[PDB]
Design a binder for these strands. Structure first.
Ligand SMILES: [Zn+2]
Lengths: 121, 99, 177, 93, 72, 73, 107, 77, 193
RNA sequence: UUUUGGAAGGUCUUGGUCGGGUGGAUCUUAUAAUUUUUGAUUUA
RNA sequence: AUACUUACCUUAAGAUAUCAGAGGAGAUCAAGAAGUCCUACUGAUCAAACAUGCGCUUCCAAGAAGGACGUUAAGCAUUUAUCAUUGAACGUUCAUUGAACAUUGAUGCAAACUCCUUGGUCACACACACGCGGAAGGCGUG
């Protein structure tokens, strides 16, 4: 997929990436992680869940693989029944764009606190 | 005594005394007298090796690991030498120690 | 310990189940809540796409057509009209079969909204606490309304028409009332 | 305390969620009240057994540690829980 | 830490699905912070029936879910 | 009256029997020591594969996890 | 006394990992979490001779075309069954545990 | 009536010393029948006069510290 | 519907009910780990077929610190067995000695007299020094002539224990090298405050 | 004569224009016992 | 906004680099604890941010990548569309009684069309060898 994932990044740095998290069942969830926690409960935006069927599993044995996708959208997956997560797509907006966006979010937040201080007066 | 009720910083010593004079005295013996033990695991992997460290969780470093299991379909018994291993204690069923 | 309510921008000094339930049912929370969710949707619908539109590089361009701009007052007016009309088209449902089956033997079990058994126990349970001061149900049978055209019902309502094309109707209907 | 995802599950109260269970059952219905321990209570529940049938519970209470995931509605994509920078209005004293 | 919200089901006939095919119907006499559940008049339903004595208590690990058979 | 820790204290120095979770395997030996997490350290144990001995084991250590119960013989 | 700290001394070291599933994983540790969520760049991972759930969990992780070559795999702690260290590494150096030393001086 | 929580119910059930059909976790688990002589918080239950009967000639087992997690279900037979 | 109508109807407008078909996992009856578990007693042969044991050497590295701590404590106890024979201590009454410590270095002995003559006539005074540096160590031993002004010098309200001798607060005790039953100095695990 | 370091000037390129019973984040400890990390998902 | 009333609730703990010395806490007993603790002290390693490079490495225009929760499409091949009791006829068929999604599906094999979203459709040049500013990562220095 030649995506070249950041060699020194873990979960909090992986935010808004498009993941391919894999579970104990062998089902795959694909989508933007928007949040995790201590127990690895993930949210997953626009998520699609794919299985292989039992029948297509025979072809998977030691190729074109009719994976079955249902569309779960905004789901919020659990840390108990997962196995492992990888990264599939990079996010939409680049590091400069994410950086300028975070600057604007912080300026707006400081401004809202100034407005709270004004209404408190 | 209850676990919160012990204190801070007694708790480590109370674990260590539980290690020396508890059920842990087989893994206590095996690390200090370097005798080989035989770990049976949940996935049929018998393991014959010498123990380097202990855990509360029975996370165990193992050195010069023999491991051996059984492919039952007939049977081929397969063995593998793994020299430096770190084994989680969840899989560990029973630690047998030879004299 | 502290439960920050992101909508209310207030705190709960010590989290427990009962102050959470009582806060999330609280009318102040529901009002700021509804304002926020409406607000996020009207922002996302308002927010223009503004794609990059990577312009390619290209004889047969001989025809030239006149663009049509508008005045800034005219822009703001037609945008306001479109806002009101989107808000109508989303909200409006179609009555008809309520007004059609008005006299029916089992209208008052089926369309009267919590006598249906399926959604029925909801609307009793979804009723809000009525702490401030100030139904046609299953009892209705056939012999309640024996003859509907004795006691005059209103006619079937005349169908609705786009005002943009209201000028282009058939003038002078056959058969005056 | 909670952390972001179970706070989201505390947010999506009274709205149409869909749960897979570890058995493969995917309940679906309105979410009466979730707890912090992810025990979730649901209403007007339409259920899919592992065998492929469908039935209708009225009033289910599925335990948290057999939830496979839960799907909330789409709009909570845009939620103030996700805002990384919203500053705190002077915590109580 | 939080005790579960089975207060609405306090006397109403509930149906546990226990473990994956065990289905037990009783009346919810009790609940603790683990969803250990005390049922009265447990009557295990196989798809044949089998009654389960006067009182019973069922492990909150084994319990998957429970339905209110009684109206609320 | 009795709880698992008093029964387990009094269990010490007895030919104990241990059914694991799995019913394939049971260890009959003399109980040496037990923690608060109910880990089991035993001596000169005896295997039973579905009931029949496959050998005498020696001093042995079961994790608290895999054992379904312990009995006094 | 926990041994995850041992693994925390092992950033940029090349191990293999066998999972409770049966998946075998080859590729360096970039870090390790408190409860042993081990993140691993430059993986190629294999499944020895078979488990159908493991077959699905192998293929579906992208770049299968049964060695699957992946840039970056986070692995959850309760999936890691056993982890094979490099034999070049000296265990006498790592198990010394400066925290356990300080605690001996704390006593 | 009132609430009968599980801890207090098993203690009442311990005083009365009535017989117990205790069940187990899955297909391996063998239905034990006994009389409770005591429990704990982790639901490790020392049961007296145990008779194990396979899943559908029950054999005695004596007195047992039964582990907590393997229990599915207590009943009074 | 829920409490407010507008966004519950329009905005949230949730997901389609989702398509189901056949799972891959096992439908509870067979979730098993491994009921066919090993029968270890065969492997008691193969360890003979396994046949030295490598040096542990890390528990040695901790055991060196533990043994050094016990050896330093034992050297302490050897200094504990090894104060009537001592020539610095004068065989006066122990009850008429007052100990002072936390003393400034440049404090002259005549000043020590001057702060101490207020209560009783002083018999003799030994301020303790290093024997190799000859810096004043910071503590001194005073015997008065009576016990009662040693006690009034021990009773401290407005006086000694808290007096600022050469712009520093000092500490003022009865001598416990002779008096109390179990006393060890700082070198010997004891000491006060 | 060469190398290194510091200073100054000129030229080019890129970027910008002390306290706190405060909260949050990370890591330890309760916390290896039924609810996510100390295993009941290689189906025997 | 203010007042009044009611209901509910009021504190898990600790740390924020690590190691070795300088000095302090100038250690309450006859010259000394050991240790442990702190620091605008120093030295070493590590982590984070920022800047700069790497004659770093890779990816950037009818087609290429991804998707269709679209069709052609009942395309073709295969399979399946409850149990129990009683009566009758020669295991089957029919009838009665009691109990509990969908065939145009499902599964496999493809193939084609149409549609969708993204991208430096850059600057230079259009020629016979054996460029700047973008995006993602690695390393180095400060
Ligand atoms: Zn609120």
């Amino acid at each position: 997929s030649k995506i070249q994932v950041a060699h020194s990044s873990r979960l909090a740095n992986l935010i808004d990436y498009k993941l391919r998290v894999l579970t104990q069942d062998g089902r795959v969830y694909i989508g933007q992680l928007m949040a995790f926690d201590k127990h690895m409960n993930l949210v997953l935006n626009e998520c699609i869940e794919e299985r292989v069927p039992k029948t297509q599993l025979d072809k998977l044995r030691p190729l074109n693989i009719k994976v079955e996708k249902r569309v779960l959208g905004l789901t919020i997956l659990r840390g108990e029944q997962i196995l492992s997560t990888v990264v599939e797509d990079k996010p939409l907006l680049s590091k400069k764009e994410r950086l300028v966006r975070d600057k604007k979010e912080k300026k707006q937040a400081q401004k809202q606190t100034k407005l709270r201080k004004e209404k408190e007066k | 005594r209850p676990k919160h009720e012990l204190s801070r910083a007694e708790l480590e010593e109370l674990e260590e005394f539980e290690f020396k004079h508890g059920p842990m005295s087989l893994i206590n013996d095996a690390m200090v007298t370097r005798t080989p033990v035989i770990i049976s695991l949940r996935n049929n992997h018998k393991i014959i090796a010498r123990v380097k460290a202990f855990d509360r969780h029975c996370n165990m470093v193992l050195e010069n690991v023999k491991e051996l299991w059984t492919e039952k379909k007939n049977v081929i018994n397969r063995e593998r030498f793994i020299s430096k291993l770190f084994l989680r204690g969840d899989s560990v069923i029973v630690v047998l120690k030879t004299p | 310990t502290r439960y920050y309510c992101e909508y209310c921008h207030s705190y709960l000094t010590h989290d427990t189940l009962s102050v959470r339930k009582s806060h999330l049912v609280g009318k102040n929370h529901l009002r700021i809540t509804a304002d926020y969710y409406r607000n996020k949707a009207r922002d996302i619908i308002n927010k223009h796409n503004h794609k990059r539109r990577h312009i390619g590089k290209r004889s047969s361009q001989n025809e030239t057509l006149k663009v049509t701009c508008l005045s800034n007052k005219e822009k703001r007016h037609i945008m306001h009209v479109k806002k009101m009309n989107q808000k109508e088209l989303a909200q409006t449902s179609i009555d008809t079969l309520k007004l059609l089956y008005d006299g029916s033997p089992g209208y008052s079990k089926v369309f009267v909204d919590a006598n249906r058994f399926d959604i029925g126990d909801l609307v009793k349970a979804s009723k809000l606490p009525q702490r401030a001061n100030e139904s046609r149900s299953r009892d209705e049978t056939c012999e309640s309304n024996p003859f509907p055209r004795l006691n005059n019902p209103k006619k079937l309502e005349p169908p609705k028409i786009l005002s943009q094309w209201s000028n282009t109707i058939p003038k002078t209907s056959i058969f005056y009332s | 305390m909670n952390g972001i995802p179970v706070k989201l599950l505390n947010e999506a109260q009274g709205h149409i969620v869909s749960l897979e269970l570890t058995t493969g059952a995917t309940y679906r219905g309105k979410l009466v009240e979730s707890e912090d321990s992810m025990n979730v209570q649901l209403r007007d529940v339409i259920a899919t057994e592992p065998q492929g049938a469908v039935t209708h519970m009225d009033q289910i209470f599925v335990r948290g540690s057999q939830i496979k995931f839960i799907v909330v509605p789409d709009l909570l994509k845009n939620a103030p829980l996700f805002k990384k920078n919203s500053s705190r209005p002077m915590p109580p004293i | 830490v939080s005790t579960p919200e089975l207060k609405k089901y306090m006397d109403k006939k509930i149906l546990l699905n226990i473990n994956g095919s065990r289905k037990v119907a009783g009346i919810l006499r009790g609940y603790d912070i683990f969803l250990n559940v005390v049922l009265d008049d447990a009557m295990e339903i196989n798809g044949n029936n089998h009654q389960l004595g006067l009182q019973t208590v069922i492990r909150g690990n084994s319990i998957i879910s429970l339905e209110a058979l009684d109206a609320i | 009256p009795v709880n698992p820790k008093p029964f387990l204290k009094g269990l010490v120095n007895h030919r104990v029997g241990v059914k694991l979770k799995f019913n394939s395997t049971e260890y009959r030996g003399t109980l040496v020591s037990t923690d608060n997490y109910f880990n089991l350290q035993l001596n000169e144990a005896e295997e039973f594969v579905a009931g029949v001995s496959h050998g005498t084991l020696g001093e042995i250590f079961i994790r608290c996890n895999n054992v379904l119960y312990i009995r006094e013989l | 006394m926990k041994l995850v700290n041992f693994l925390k001394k092992l950033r940029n070291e090349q191990v293999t990992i066998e999972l409770k599933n049966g998946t075998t994983v080859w590729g360096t540790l970039q870090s390790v979490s408190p409860q042993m969520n081990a993140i691993l760049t430059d993986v190629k991972l294999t499944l020895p001779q078979s488990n159908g759930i493991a077959m699905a969990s192998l293929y579906l992780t992208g770049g299968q075309q049964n060695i699957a070559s992946l840039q970056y795999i986070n692995i959850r702690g309760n999936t890691i069954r056993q982890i094979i260290l490099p034999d070049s590494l000296n265990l006498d150096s790592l198990l010394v545990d400066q925290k356990q030393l300080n605690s001996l001086r704390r006593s | 009536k009132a609430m009968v929580p599980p801890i207090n119910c098993i203690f009442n059930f311990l005083q009365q010393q009535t017989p117990v059909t205790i069940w187990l976790f899955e297909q391996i688990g063998i239905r034990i029948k006994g009389k409770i002589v005591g429990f704990d918080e982790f639901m490790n239950v020392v049961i007296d006069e145990a008779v194990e009967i396979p899943v559908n000639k029950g054999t005695p087992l004596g007195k047992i510290l039964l582990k907590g997690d393997n229990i599915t279900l207590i009943t009074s037979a | 519907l829920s409490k407010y109508p507008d966004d519950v109807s329009r905005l949230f407008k949730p997901r389609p009910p989702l398509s189901y078909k056949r799972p891959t996992d096992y439908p509870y009856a067979k979730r098993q780990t491994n009921p066919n578990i090993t029968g270890v007693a065969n492997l008691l042969s193969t360890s003979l077929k396994h046949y030295x044991x490598x040096x542990x050497x890390x528990x040695x590295x901790x055991x060196x610190x533990x043994x050094x701590x016990x050896x330093x404590x034992x050297x302490x106890x050897x200094x504990x067995x090894x104060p009537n024979v001592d020539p610095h201590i004068k065989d006066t009454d122990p009850y008429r000695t007052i100990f002072i410590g936390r003393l400034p270095y440049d404090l002259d002995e005549i000043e020590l007299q001057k702060y101490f003559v207020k209560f009783g006539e002083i018999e003799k005074i030994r301020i303790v020094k290093d024997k190799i540096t000859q810096k004043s160590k910071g503590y001194a031993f005073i015997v008065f002539k009576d016990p009662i002004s040693s006690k009034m010098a021990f009773k401290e309200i407005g006086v000694h224990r808290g007096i600022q001798i050469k712009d520093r607060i000092c500490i003022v005790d009865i001598e416990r090298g002779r008096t109390v039953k179990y006393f060890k100095p700082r070198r010997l695990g004891g000491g006060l405050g």
